[PDB]
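for the recovery benchmark. tokens below, seq after
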């Protein structure tokens, strides 16, 4: 009685991958989540009249190999590619995350959303138009989030589900 959607959250250390996932699931902002915990979470939610079971991998620790992450990259249906709007380097890093996904899928048409997180912080070094340019180039949506205030968080995830449906029958 539910449709499963396999989602993968990627991006540089410290951008708020865990914070966004935890906010989606618990409606809580977690100040201090272990940067090393990689794991999958489940969320049941009704999106456009369909009862969805989201199966979400919150990735961590790019440095080392991971059997879980390997399985999710190969079989994941969509990707949230996250940078922080006060972390220029994380924005610059998006290129590499996107290339890695393109390679695993042997494809340039992969359901993905570019997410610019920490929108509540005043120290903004990546402008919305830089992000809009980058997403336009990739042919993907751009959404600004705050895992702290929850602004944009459901939007990011609902939009990814919709991009998955645009790509394949579910
Ligand atoms: N102010 C603010 N801080 C955030 C936001 N998202 C995450 N953080 C903080 O940024 C740091 C890294 O978040 P975390 O989720 O562990 O990042 P991860 O390494 O990508 O999983 C933590 O202190 C979080 O409390 C946000 O939207 N706003
Ligand atoms: Mg994390
Ligand atoms: Na959170």
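predicted aa per position
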């Amino acid at each position: 009685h539910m449709t499963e959607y396999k989602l993968v959250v990627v991006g540089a250390a410290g951008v708020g991958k865990s914070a966004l996932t935890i906010q989606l699931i618990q409606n809580h902002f977690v100040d201090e989540y272990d940067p090393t915990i990689e794991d999958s979470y489940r969320k049941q939610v009704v999106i456009d009249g369909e009862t969805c079971l989201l199966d979400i991998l919150d990735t961590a620790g790019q440095e080392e190999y991971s059997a879980m992450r390997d399985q999710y990259m190969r079989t994941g249906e969509g990707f949230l590619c996250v940078f922080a709007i006060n972390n220029t380097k994380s924005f610059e890093d998006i290129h590499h995350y996107r290339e890695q996904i393109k390679r695993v899928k042997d494809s340039e048409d992969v359901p993905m959303v570019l997410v610019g997180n920490k929108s509540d912080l005043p120290s903004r070094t990546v402008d919305t138009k830089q992000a809009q340019d980058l997403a336009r180039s990739y042919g993907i949506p751009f959404i600004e989030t705050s895992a702290k205030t929850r602004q944009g968080v459901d939007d990011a995830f609902y939009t990814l589900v919709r991009e998955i449906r645009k790509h394949k029958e579910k």
